[PDB]
Amino acid sequence: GSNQNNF
Ligand SMILES: [Zn+2]
């Protein structure tokens, strides 16, 4: 699966 971190 794909992953996104929005800090
Ligand atoms: Zn993955």
Side-chain angles (χ1 to χ4, degrees):
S2 296
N3 300 98
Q4 195 202 55
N5 288 295
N6 311 302
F7 295 88

